[PDB]
Design a protein around this ligand. Sequence first.
Ligand SMILES: Nc1ncnc2c1ncn2[C@@H]1O[C@H](COP(=O)(O)OP(=O)(O)O)[C@@H](O)[C@H]1O
Ligand SMILES: [Mg+2]
Ligand SMILES: [Zn+2]
Ligand SMILES: [Zn+2]
Lengths: 239, 242, 96, 96, 568
Amino acid sequence: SVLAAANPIYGRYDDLKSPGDNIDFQTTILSRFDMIFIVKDDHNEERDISIANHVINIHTGNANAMQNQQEENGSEISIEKMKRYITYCRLKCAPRLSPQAAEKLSSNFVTIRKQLLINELESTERSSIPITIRQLEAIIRITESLAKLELSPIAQERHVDEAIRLFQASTMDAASQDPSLSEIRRFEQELKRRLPIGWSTSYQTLRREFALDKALYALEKHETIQLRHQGQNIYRSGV
Amino acid sequence: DSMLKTKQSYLKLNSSVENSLNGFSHLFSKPLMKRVKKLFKNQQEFILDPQYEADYVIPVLPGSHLNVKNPLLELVKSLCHVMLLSKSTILEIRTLRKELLKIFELREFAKVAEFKDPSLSLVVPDFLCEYCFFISDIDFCKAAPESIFSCVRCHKAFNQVLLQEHLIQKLRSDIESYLIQDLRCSRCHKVKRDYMSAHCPCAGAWEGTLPRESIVQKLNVFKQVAKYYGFDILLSCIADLT
Amino acid sequence: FRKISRDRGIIDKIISSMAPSIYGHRDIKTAVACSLFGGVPKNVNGKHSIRGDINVLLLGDPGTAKSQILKYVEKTAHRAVFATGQGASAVGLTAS
Amino acid sequence: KIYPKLHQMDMDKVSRVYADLRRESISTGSFPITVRHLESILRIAESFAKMRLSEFVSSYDLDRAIKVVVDSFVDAQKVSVRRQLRRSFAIYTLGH
Amino acid sequence: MYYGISQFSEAYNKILRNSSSHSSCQLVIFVSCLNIDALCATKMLSLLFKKQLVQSQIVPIFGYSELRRHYSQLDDNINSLLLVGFGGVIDLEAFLEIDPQEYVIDTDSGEQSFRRDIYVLDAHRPWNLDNIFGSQIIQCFDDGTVDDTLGEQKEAYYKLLELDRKQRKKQIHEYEGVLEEYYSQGTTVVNSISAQIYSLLSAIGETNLSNLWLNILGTTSLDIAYAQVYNRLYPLLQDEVKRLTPSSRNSVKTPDTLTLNIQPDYYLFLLRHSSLYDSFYYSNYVNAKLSLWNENGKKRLHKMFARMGIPLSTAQETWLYMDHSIKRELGIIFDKNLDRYGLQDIIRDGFVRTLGYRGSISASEFVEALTALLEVGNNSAQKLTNLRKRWVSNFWLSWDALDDRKVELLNRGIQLAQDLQRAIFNTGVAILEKKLIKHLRIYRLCVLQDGPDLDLYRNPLTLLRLGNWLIECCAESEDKQLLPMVLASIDENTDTYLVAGLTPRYPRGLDTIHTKKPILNNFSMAFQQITAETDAKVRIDNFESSIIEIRREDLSPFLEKLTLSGLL
Ligand SMILES: Nc1ncnc2c1ncn2[C@@H]1O[C@H](COP(=O)(O)OP(=O)(O)O)[C@@H](O)[C@H]1O
Ligand SMILES: [Mg+2]
Ligand SMILES: [Zn+2]
Ligand SMILES: [Zn+2]
């Protein structure tokens, strides 16, 4: 197994630049890798406080007490017992997929490939993140591992759902990263002048007025518009 | 009086980063902490001895949601919060607060040493006075009882039945809004737009915009207000809820 | 050492004695003293290891006795190794 | 021969200082403030306790380390926002 | 006097008549957990009643509230109760809400019988006069003190009982003053329960090697705190060992030989299961003799080990694996270089038990392992009850450690003893570095606010072990006068401190005229009087009266009031 730790160029990820600019690794090497996590420093002050408290407990001898107590509680287990359990599970079970799991995996793979195709079409550029048959093999292997850690001889759709969730959380998270602008600006200005500051209108009104319409998502990031009625109503939040 | 004298002296000498008040604490610094020490000794003498708990008793208010283990600590925290309002003297006020906490042997940045508002809020939006046609928002957890049963511009009273009706109206409106809220992702915060979805397509769990804990706190506030002011119909509504 | 340790203000006297032949720059002296004494390397249960050494970077205009400060540190610390600019390759810094 | 311990300390002030450091780094700032930087405060406090031969990190050893860290961060920022950052951080270096 | 030593067999026969009905279980044994001597005594009684097939109930109790709750839950069929290690100082009939009239059956005929007879067995000297004299339900097993030194107390108590003018009031006041000066005295112990039950068993004549070993363990349990009593009782155990041992000495070692021997048992810590260097480094006596908490202490320890000529690696090697040369000349080596450093009192003669090829073991090491198993074997009033549950559970671990078939448990107990000694040593050295002990004119207070492994000291025996460490250390400081110390430990989960009133003791081996006079722990009445007034939510439930739980907020006012109190 390969567990690699790398760093995007410029130290930070530098999401303002293109995702292919931040990663110097070519598509070939990225194709072999199954899961590709991209962690980002949120600088969330409450999260910062939580991490600071955890680290302070780590340093001031509190870790050696709380980890031991929590391990004795049974929700954590020592290194050696995990080692032996992993060995036993790997030497004991080699699960295989159920036909329903196969159908679900095929459907999810087609969905993921369609998503990558539409993303590349919108960007007019091949995505640095490759999604191929090897990715489907990776999902199959993760489903097998999930069934194996439970020692289940056959993989259930619960493992398929969890593997799809993890894939979306890591590989799609990498592939969903984004760095015409004239159309976006025109839409922004026309809705600012038309849609009143304190009022709302249905999304179908914007459709009839007239694309992917990423401008609305960008404005939601700017917190000037907000989709509330399950995406059927855009309200000028007050900006 | 300290800030008044400081402002007068500053104006006399002359005639926000820095205003007329920059050392007003010094007018009472020694008396303040001396009196704090004396009151601390007094309390420690009478914190446990009976017939003084009638003095060391925390009054019950409609907005009461904070437990006070030390009435003197609550007092000093309240004074520190009121004297921290000046932006120019922030450093000297923080130093005075630290010295006051040293009397309690408490750290300056201690969470218990941090002061928070002991009163919640429960406003009735768009309250209308049936005589002068005055539009107001009637709070109960912060507004005084004299300011809630009668109008402001005039002094005519209000209907108890109307107060209970509108309070229950806001309560049921909040309940319905919680029950009719929209879901959104927990990771990219995209609003949920379908009906069948375990999570966001980005593997983000669905979550409501109005937390259940928020409605729990609102119900607790309504129950506290009903019990404090004897709101019979509000208590009936609370009983109907569960 | 035990007697002078109980003295109050020993930190400032130590800081001032980092660069007796170099005027001013008290913060640099304090940082150098902190790195010299260093922290305790924590190791949680043998699983999580925490660096206990302090690394300090001095960015400054030429002729500011930064090189002289480094020379003092080299003469001072128990185990000191000095390398300069391009006169030290990647493998020669760590191992080969 | 000195291995100081951080038993006597207030995690609240350190946590708030680290949170504010990250908040000002992400907002109009270029200095990276990471968990390593939070550990740096404890490391400098340990060095302060070492230089006094103290086996426990006193409150002064923590306040001095916090002041050193915040001053080093502030001096690494541009002068345009340096005054505002110093004004924000002044509430943490109390007593010196 | 209620039951003298010579008439213990009468009580045994009465209990046998009362509850030798195998149809039911009408005899219940109450034992105070966290007390080694009580555990040994209960093991003796359990084996004895296993012999006569008398069904019995064994209930380990931690606090007085538990005792009263269990008695309330106690069924009426049980006509015989046994209290082990407690109940001899408090008003049980008042504590348990007991009157003679409810329990009396077949009142007639100058005699009285009762539907439930309770027999207490503890050696705390403040014998409750209402319990030793003014009741028939409460039955106490006196060790010769009440019948010899409480004659005046007996007369005064009976005068008050019979009397419920001016000279009559004067004599009543005099008698009450005599009774009161008998009271208000620190709780002290003169004898070991194990010795008392062993004497009873010898009167019954059902003794064996195992019971003698249990008596040795129970007596050794009191050596650390009550060494004078240990010296008093040592010859009796020695004579019993000489009597019971078979004449076939020097026999070839078989896997079935169980041999009790009297051999030099030096006053070290886990000598046979730890390195000699660590035994010295962790011995409380040596530590107190050289104050090892300072950096000079370790250097002087190396100085001794060099002076004897023993290599430090050899000293730091495990006891079993040392060279036979040192293992056979340890005695002479100690003879040569012990008086030089004042550690001559380390040399001592004790009892060693060998079970076949399993290796030897000393009584001190065994009782240390048992105490360790007792201590660490595994909103506010709930987690505390869970702590009581765990503490009571550890009693059964220590109990099962007595079985020779569970040596694996004994090894775990030995490891726990080593770890607990390490933790107590490190805590003591840290405290003596930071000088957490604040000397006053009443007591040397010491409160632990924060630090490492503070959750270990909420166990009462752990706090007592730390107290033993610190009191031994301060005892060898001649400059520091005799004065009790107070220890508190905040429980963050419960936000409460554990105040432990302790007592000073004379240095071990320091025998003087005042040493013969025991130190009396007057924290009991002081604690109770301070708690009765000025309600501070204090929890005084331990049978050891000098241990209380106090609110974190009320800790400082409680200590201030105690300083204002001159009772102790
Ligand atoms: N603060 C100072 N006090 C005393 N001497 C100084 C100081 N700053 C610079 N110097 C002198 O300048 C000379 C050259 O300094 P140098 O080590 O080249 O600085 P840098 O490393 O910043 O280029 C040294 O001989 C030193 O004595
Ligand atoms: Mg230079
Ligand atoms: Zn009006
Ligand atoms: Zn999402």
